Amino acid sequence: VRMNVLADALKSINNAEKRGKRQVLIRPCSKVIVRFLTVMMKHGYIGEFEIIDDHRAGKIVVNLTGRLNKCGVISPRFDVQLKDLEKWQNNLLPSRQFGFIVLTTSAGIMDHEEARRKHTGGKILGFFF
Amino acid sequence: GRMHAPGKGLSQSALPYRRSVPTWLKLTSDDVKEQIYKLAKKGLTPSQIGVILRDSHGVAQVRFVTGNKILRILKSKGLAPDLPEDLYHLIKKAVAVRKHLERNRKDKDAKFRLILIESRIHRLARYYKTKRVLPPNWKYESSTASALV
Amino acid sequence: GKCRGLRTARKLRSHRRDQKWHDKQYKKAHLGTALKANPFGGASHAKGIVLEKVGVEAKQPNSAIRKCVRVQLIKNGKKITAFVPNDGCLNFIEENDEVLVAGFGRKGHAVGDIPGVRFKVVKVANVSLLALYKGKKERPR
RNA sequence: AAGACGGUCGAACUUGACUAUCUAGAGGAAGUAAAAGUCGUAACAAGGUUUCCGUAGGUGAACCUGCGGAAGGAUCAUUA
RNA sequence: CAGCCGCGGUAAUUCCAGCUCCAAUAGCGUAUAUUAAAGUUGCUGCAGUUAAAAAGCUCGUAGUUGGAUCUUGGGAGCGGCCGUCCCCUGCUCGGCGCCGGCCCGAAGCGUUUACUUUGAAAAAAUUAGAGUGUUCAAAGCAGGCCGCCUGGAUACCGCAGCUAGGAAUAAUGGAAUAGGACCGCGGUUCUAUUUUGUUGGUUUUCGGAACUGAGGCCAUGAUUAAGAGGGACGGCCGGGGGCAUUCGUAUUGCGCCGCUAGAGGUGAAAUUCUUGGACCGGCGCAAGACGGACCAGAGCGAAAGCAUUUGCCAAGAAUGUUUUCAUUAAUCAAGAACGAAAGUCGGAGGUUCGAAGACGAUCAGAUACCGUCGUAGUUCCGACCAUAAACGAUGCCGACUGGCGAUGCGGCGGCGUUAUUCCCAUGACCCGCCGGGCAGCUUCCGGGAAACCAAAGUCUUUGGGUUCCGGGGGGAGUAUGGUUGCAAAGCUGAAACUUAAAGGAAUUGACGGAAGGGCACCACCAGGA
RNA sequence: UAGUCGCCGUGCCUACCAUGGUGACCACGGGUGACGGGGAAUCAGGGUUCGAUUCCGGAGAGGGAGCCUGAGAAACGGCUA
RNA sequence: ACUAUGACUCUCUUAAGGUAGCCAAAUGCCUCGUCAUCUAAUUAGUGACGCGCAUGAAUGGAUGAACGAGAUUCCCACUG
RNA sequence: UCAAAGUUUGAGCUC
Ligand SMILES: [Mg+2]
Ligand SMILES: [Mg+2]
Ligand SMILES: [Mg+2]
Ligand SMILES: [Mg+2]
Ligand SMILES: [Mg+2]
Ligand SMILES: [Mg+2]
Ligand SMILES: [Mg+2]
Ligand SMILES: [Mg+2]
Ligand SMILES: [Mg+2]
Ligand SMILES: [Mg+2]
Ligand SMILES: [Mg+2]
Ligand SMILES: [Mg+2]
Ligand SMILES: [Mg+2]
Ligand SMILES: [Mg+2]
Ligand SMILES: [Mg+2]
Ligand SMILES: [Mg+2]
Ligand SMILES: [Mg+2]
Ligand SMILES: [Mg+2]
Ligand SMILES: [Mg+2]
Ligand SMILES: [Mg+2]
Ligand SMILES: [Mg+2]
Ligand SMILES: [Mg+2]
Ligand SMILES: [Mg+2]
Ligand SMILES: [Mg+2]
Ligand SMILES: [Mg+2]
Ligand SMILES: [Mg+2]
Ligand SMILES: [Mg+2]
Ligand SMILES: [Mg+2]
Ligand SMILES: [Mg+2]
Ligand SMILES: [Mg+2]
Ligand SMILES: [Mg+2]
Ligand SMILES: [Mg+2]
Ligand SMILES: [Mg+2]
Ligand SMILES: [Mg+2]
Ligand SMILES: [Mg+2]
Ligand SMILES: [Mg+2]
Ligand SMILES: [Mg+2]
Ligand SMILES: [Mg+2]
Ligand SMILES: [Mg+2]
Ligand SMILES: [Mg+2]
Ligand SMILES: [Mg+2]
Ligand SMILES: [Mg+2]
Ligand SMILES: [Mg+2]
Ligand SMILES: [Mg+2]
C-alpha cells in the first residue's frame, strides 16, 4: 500500500524538473511536506505554491522555477548524531560550499547549518541542492 | 488492488464537499428515527435503510443531515444483531458453498473459493476481536456454523 | 541490500553469514580438509628424503624434460615430486640425502609444463643448492 | 594411644550403551590428465530425418522411436 | 628460463658466459598465513529479459511496513520590511512584606516510552597531543638562572546503567450498555482525637476510612469518510466450473443387394487383401473417439487450460452508485489446496492410432528414416504422482513522465438512416467522451555491452515497501547422509582432484545438399574429333 | 511448607504437597587451531583480521581424589592413597 | 600404438549360436582352484575372482521379513 | 509434392 506520501511527491517533482514542466499538481497533502516547501521557499529555491483544501487530504499546486537540480529523500528516517553529521553531509552532497540537508528536530524543521548554530542533532528527513 | 483476486477496479461512491443540507428538504431527524424504528422492527439492515431513504425520501445521507449515524442509533435502541451483517452474509455464503459441494464433490474451483473465503472470515474476525465486539471464545466451526445464518 | 528496514539487522546478518560460505576462498580457509590435506599443514618448508630421480615430460607448445625428485616426508610419510630447478644441479643431489623443500608460489595449483608439481628444493645436507651452483662452497666429503 | 561397629565422600577395576575422531582392508565401479590407435560421423549450413525439453521402452558405442510441449527454427505477412 | 604472456628448431634484445647498463644499499632476495587494492559478498555499494541466475500458481501465523486528522500563536522592551534577547505549567511553615487578604519561598504530587543535549561516572599502560636542544632523532619527563626559578598538562575512551533540560517525528492509552466529571446535601458502619478545676468512663461537637439515597450546573460526552479496503444492491458479461440431458457426420465392423478381377502401397517393389467375390456403389444396423469449417495478433480462468444441444446448481473480475463499517491493509520461512503428457495400481471399455516387437524394402552397415502387421498405453470411473523451454525464459503493491489510431466489456451523450410498424422504447448502423482490459504502432524522453524497452525508465545526482535467489569453468545436481513414494523417482545437498579461460551481443570474411538476380562452348545446350 | 548444614539469602541438603519452566527473538545439543579484556596490524569514509605474550581478572603444577596444620590452603618447591 | 585381449569384420556348420543375471553353491573332474579374513595352527566355513569338464531363464532365474522337532560354521554362559 | 554426398604429412600458419 501507499506508505510514503512525500516519497511519491518528490519523485514526481524531479520527473517534472527534468522535463522543464511549469506547474505541478500533487495529490496527497501532508503537514510535513508543507513544512518542507516553506523551508525551501523562504530561502528562495521556488515560487509561491498554493494548496487545495478538501475536507480530506488536500492537494498542492507548485509553480516551479528552474533552479532545482535535485530534491531527494532518505528512507528510513535515520537518527543523526553530531559526530555523523559531517560524514553524512560529505557523502551526501555535491560540495562543501552549497547544497543542504534538511532534518526536522525537537527544536523544529531547519537546515543543517542552522542545526550547527543551535547545537541540535536529530532525525534526518532529506536533502536538496 | 483486490485482496484475493487480480482485479484493481476503481469504482465507488464519491461524496461531495458540502456537508450542508439542501434547501428543499424539511424532514426532521426525529421523524426519520420513527421510520427507522418501524423498519428495524419489521427487520432491515442499515444498508437497505440508507438505500430506501435516498431513493424515495430523497435524503442521501443521515450522517450529513443529522449529527450521528444510523448504526449507532440502532445500537442505542437495541436493534443491532448478535454479530455483524457482513460476517452473517459470509457464513451464509460459506454454507451454500459447502452444500453445493456436498453433492458435487468434484468442484475444485468451489473448494478454492471456499478456502479463500474462510481466510477472509478470520481476518475480519480478528479485527472485530480487537474492536471488542465478539468474545474471545467466538469461533467459526463448520460443524456449528450452520446453526448461525 | 533490498530490505532497507530499520529493524532487519538480524535478517541481514544471517543472510550474509549463509552466503560467505558460497565464496570458494573463505570455505577454503575455514574448513580443515584443505589444511589437513596439505602435507605442509600451513607451513613454508618441510624436510624430506630423496628416494628417486624422475624425468617428467613437459606440456604442449613447450617441450622439455623437467628433472623432478620423489621425496618422502618424515612426519607424515607422504610422497612428493619436488622439482630441482636450474642447469646442472642434479648431479649434486645424491640419493638418500635430506633436502628442505618449499612451495612454488601458487597455493595449491600446478605450474606450466611440470604437471602437478608444487614444490622445489632449497638445501641439500645443510648446504645451499645456490652455493653449490655458484661455486662458493663444496659438498662435505 | 592401639583398635573396632556405622555413616558420608569415593579413587580404582570389570562390563554395557550411546557418542565424537582417525584408520588397514581382497576386489569392484567412477572422474580427470598425456597419444598421431580401432569402429563410425550425431551436432554447427535443412549437417543432409530441424534442433532442444519432460517422460517411458530399446540398442556395441555414439543414439532410435512413441505421446505432449518450446523456438533459442528454414515462416513476424498471403488476400471473399 | 619463465609467478603470467611467452623464449629456444644456426645473425637468440628472453638460455650459458664476457662486455656494458638499471633499481635499492649494509642490506637485498625466496616461501607461507594475512590486509588494502575488491563497488569480485556490497548497510553506505553488486547483480537476476539474452553473459550464472525469479519458487509452476495461489492461500497462510510469527517476521518486516503501514494514509490523513488535535497549538496555532501572544505581551513588553531591543537591533539593521526583516532578526533577536525577556516570558508562555497546576494543585503545611515564613518575609521583598503591605493595609484577615495578596505574592513569593519550601514540602509532596504528577498518564507513559523511543529520540536528542548536559554532568557525573569512567583502572593505568597504549593512541593522538601541549611543553621539553636525548649534540639531531629513536627516547625520557625532565630541567633552567647565578641561593633562586619552574614543569611533570590535555583529548578520545564503543555498548548498557544513572543524572537533569528539550518535545517536532514513531507508538500508546482515555467519556459511548455512560457504574461520566466539578462542587455540593443526607444516611449506614468504623474512629484521629480535643473536651466537662481534680479522682474515672462514654457519646457528641469536631476531624479521618468504607458503604448508600436523591440534586444543581458541564456548549454536557461519539475526528473525516482516503483516486486504502471489506460487505450490500441493479441489469448485464464471459469456450469460467460441476452434474445430468440432446445432436451430427465421418469412422472402422457387421448384414443384405448390384457389376465384376484385381486391390494395396512406393522414389521403384514385395510380404498383405483378393474368382470361397476384392475394391467400387446403394440401404439398414454397430461402438467409441472427435465436435471441423463459423475461430480473431478475441474472451475467461490461480495456473495447466477451457468450444455439439438443453436443463439444474452456485460464483466472479469489470461497470453505475450522495449503499454500510471506519484501518479492518501489503508482502511472507514453517504449514497447506490445485497442478498438461508419459508412468503406476485396480475395475469398466477396448473404435483408431501406436512405444515394444516381427517381417518385407534401400543401403558398405540401419537392429532407423519407408511398409505390413502389431503389444502395453491412448477412452471412462476409482486410487497414486508433482515433474516441462510449467517462456513474457521478465516476482507482488504503489507513484510519476509522449503521442497515435484500431478493438472487447459496462456506462454516458449526440443530427440522421434502418426493423418493431402505427408512435414510444428497444434492437443494427453512425459520431464522440469515461474506467481497466488483451494487444499494436510511434519519436534523440532517457536508459542499456549492445540486441532492445513508455519500460528492461525515474542510478556515482546511487535508499518507496517486501520475499526468493547467483559469485571462474569442470568435477556434480554425483557422493555420503536425511526424508517422501507400492515402484518410478522427487526433495535437501558436499569434497577431493584437475584446469586459464568458459560465454554474450554485434562486425568482416569463408562456407551453404537456403532463396533471388546475372554471365561462360577450358559451363551447359545442340552436336562434332 | 518445616527443618538440616552453613557466618547469613537460596533444592545448598532432607522430608511432605503442587506440576511447572525453555523453544524459529535459534533454546537444546554438537564444534571452536577460543583463556578474557585493556590493545596491534590495516586503512578515504564505512569496515576487515589478529590479540599465549612484561598491566588487570581466571584457572593449573604427572593423572584424579582426600586431608591435617593455619586468621588465610581443598596448598602441590606440605602430607595419604 | 607393450603383451595379452580382441570393440569390429568374415566364413564353415546347423534353424538360431547362452542376452539379462549367478557360482568351485546340494550343480566343478584335474581341485585342498587363487587371494583376503576367521585359528598359534584350519583339505571345513564366510566375501570377491571365472577359463563355467557339464550355470541359466514358468523343464522357471535372482532376491527376500516372518516360520522350521530341516542341513552345516562360529561365539557367550554353562557343565563328570 | 525430398532414398545418399565420409576422410585427408608427424615433417613448422602467425604480430
Ligand atoms: Mg497477498
Ligand atoms: Mg543425426
Ligand atoms: Mg529436409
Ligand atoms: Mg539433425
Ligand atoms: Mg542452432
Ligand atoms: Mg527394437
Ligand atoms: Mg644475457
Ligand atoms: Mg575499495
Ligand atoms: Mg579483502
Ligand atoms: Mg546459456
Ligand atoms: Mg543464462
Ligand atoms: Mg514466477
Ligand atoms: Mg524459472
Ligand atoms: Mg501515514
Ligand atoms: Mg462435432
Ligand atoms: Mg501448457
Ligand atoms: Mg518457505
Ligand atoms: Mg496425466
Ligand atoms: Mg496421467
Ligand atoms: Mg497398477
Ligand atoms: Mg503406424
Ligand atoms: Mg533386419
Ligand atoms: Mg513404423
Ligand atoms: Mg519446468
Ligand atoms: Mg543499485
Ligand atoms: Mg563453479
Ligand atoms: Mg591449460
Ligand atoms: Mg578443366
Ligand atoms: Mg546451349
Ligand atoms: Mg583501554
Ligand atoms: Mg593478567
Ligand atoms: Mg577478569
Ligand atoms: Mg595451577
Ligand atoms: Mg596437590
Ligand atoms: Mg629446585
Ligand atoms: Mg608454589
Ligand atoms: Mg565360495
Ligand atoms: Mg548363463
Ligand atoms: Mg524343474
Ligand atoms: Mg536346458
Ligand atoms: Mg535345472
Ligand atoms: Mg539371502
Ligand atoms: Mg541420408
Ligand atoms: Mg596426415
Side-chain angles (χ1 to χ4, degrees):
Chain A
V1 286
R2 185 188 271 100
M3 305 298 179
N4 308 345
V5 164
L6 184 135
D8 285 16
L10 310 180
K11 198 148 259 168
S12 42
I13 83 173
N14 188 50
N15 296 13
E17 66 94 39
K18 281 180 164 180
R19 222 200 256 287
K21 204 76 81 179
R22 186 74 260 210
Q23 315 181 29
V24 55
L25 175 54
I26 60 181
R27 174 205 152 260
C29 174
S30 280
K31 187 191 292 189
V32 174
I33 285 169
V34 167
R35 312 272 178 202
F36 197 102
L37 296 181
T38 276
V39 172
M40 292 196 292
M41 191 193 269
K42 287 237 175 198
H43 304 322
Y45 286 81
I46 51 160
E48 64 183 357
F49 71 87
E50 188 199 294
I51 73 188
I52 298 154
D53 83 325
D54 48 294
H55 281 122
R56 267 165 281 283
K59 305 193 181 178
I60 311 180
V61 175
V62 183
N63 295 354
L64 194 92
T65 56
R67 282 171 191 188
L68 293 184
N69 292 292
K70 195 176 185 179
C71 170
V73 69
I74 294 284
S75 184
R77 319 199 203 285
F78 294 106
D79 57 21
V80 184
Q81 267 101 32
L82 281 306
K83 295 178 293 198
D84 217 39
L85 184 52
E86 181 284 347
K87 295 195 287 283
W88 273 101
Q89 72 184 50
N90 176 60
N91 178 88
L92 208 78
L93 296 176
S95 67
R96 284 165 52 60
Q97 308 292 342
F98 78 98
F100 291 97
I101 278 180
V102 70
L103 38 74
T104 184
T105 63
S106 62
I109 286 168
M110 65 207 93
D111 300 341
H112 77 75
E113 288 165 340
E114 188 175 335
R116 210 81 84 195
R117 297 164 184 105
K118 293 185 178 181
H119 196 76
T120 315
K123 305 202 177 185
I124 190 170
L125 286 199
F127 60 97
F128 60 94
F129 51 84
Chain B
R2 313 286 180 260
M3 200 210 285
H4 306 147
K8 283 156 86 176
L10 181 67
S11 71
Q12 71 266 68
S13 53
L15 272 166
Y17 188 84
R18 305 201 275 225
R19 292 96 80 87
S20 58
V21 300
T23 75
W24 78 76
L25 284 182
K26 51 173 173 311
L27 277 149
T28 54
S29 182
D30 274 1
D31 299 355
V32 169
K33 284 181 82 131
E34 184 280 347
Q35 205 73 47
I36 289 190
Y37 185 50
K38 169 71 68 56
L39 301 147
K41 165 167 199 69
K42 171 159 50 176
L44 219 65
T45 80
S47 311
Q48 268 172 349
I49 289 160
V51 165
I52 285 285
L53 287 176
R54 79 148 149 63
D55 301 313
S56 61
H57 296 90
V59 180
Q61 289 294 126
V62 174
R63 209 212 289 102
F64 301 144
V65 174
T66 67
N68 302 328
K69 51 175 62 170
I70 297 175
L71 184 55
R72 201 175 251 167
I73 293 156
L74 276 163
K75 192 263 281 170
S76 65
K77 269 186 181 166
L79 284 290
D82 62 333
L83 38 60
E85 63 92 39
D86 62 323
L87 187 66
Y88 165 99
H89 284 300
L90 269 164
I91 290 165
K92 191 186 179 218
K93 189 181 281 152
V95 168
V97 160
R98 174 192 306 291
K99 186 177 67 187
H100 157 79
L101 189 141
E102 192 166 291
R103 308 180 318 161
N104 306 128
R105 298 282 162 77
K106 272 287 263 290
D107 280 301
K108 285 311 200 306
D109 212 350
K111 183 183 161 182
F112 172 81
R113 298 286 160 192
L114 181 44
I115 295 290
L116 304 185
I117 296 156
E118 174 223 342
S119 316
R120 217 189 274 198
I121 293 164
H122 297 311
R123 278 148 161 267
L124 280 175
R126 88 187 167 185
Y127 165 68
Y128 290 123
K129 275 193 286 287
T130 53
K131 198 149 70 176
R132 300 148 41 75
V133 52
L134 298 169
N137 210 309
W138 197 93
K139 191 181 297 228
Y140 166 75
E141 297 301 311
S142 49
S143 306
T144 65
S146 313
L148 282 67
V149 184
Chain C
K2 186 148 200 170
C3 52
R4 323 197 183 276
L6 195 169
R7 306 185 266 246
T8 42
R10 74 166 71 259
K11 158 72 161 184
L12 288 164
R13 209 201 328 158
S14 63
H15 186 263
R16 176 63 48 241
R17 174 170 71 209
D18 288 25
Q19 300 281 284
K20 266 178 177 182
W21 293 103
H22 293 119
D23 190 273
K24 193 177 172 184
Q25 292 93 38
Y26 173 91
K27 190 166 201 171
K28 199 264 287 174
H30 290 79
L31 285 167
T33 56
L35 197 77
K36 313 285 181 187
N38 197 349
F40 277 23
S44 42
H45 305 257
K47 282 172 73 177
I49 293 154
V50 173
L51 45 75
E52 56 188 339
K53 314 203 303 190
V54 179
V56 284
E57 55 204 7
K59 250 162 170 182
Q60 267 277 294
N62 294 302
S63 161
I65 303 164
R66 290 287 90 73
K67 273 80 207 176
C68 295
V69 160
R70 292 186 64 71
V71 177
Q72 185 182 356
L73 297 183
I74 304 304
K75 68 195 251 167
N76 287 113
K78 293 167 177 175
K79 306 190 186 180
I80 310 172
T81 24
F83 173 66
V84 190
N86 295 288
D87 58 84
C89 288
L90 189 65
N91 294 341
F92 295 124
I93 207 172
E94 257 70 63
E95 272 172 305
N96 311 324
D97 284 328
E98 70 283 50
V99 304
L100 183 69
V101 187
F104 215 75
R106 314 282 287 158
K107 306 181 172 198
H109 181 279
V111 202
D113 286 359
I114 38 172
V117 177
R118 289 163 262 292
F119 300 93
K120 80 197 196 182
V121 64
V122 186
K123 293 172 115 180
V124 190
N126 175 253
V127 177
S128 188
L129 188 65
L130 172 139
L132 299 165
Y133 172 82
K134 301 303 282 291
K136 298 201 175 193
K137 300 185 182 182
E138 195 174 318
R139 167 178 210 67
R141 329 165 50 183

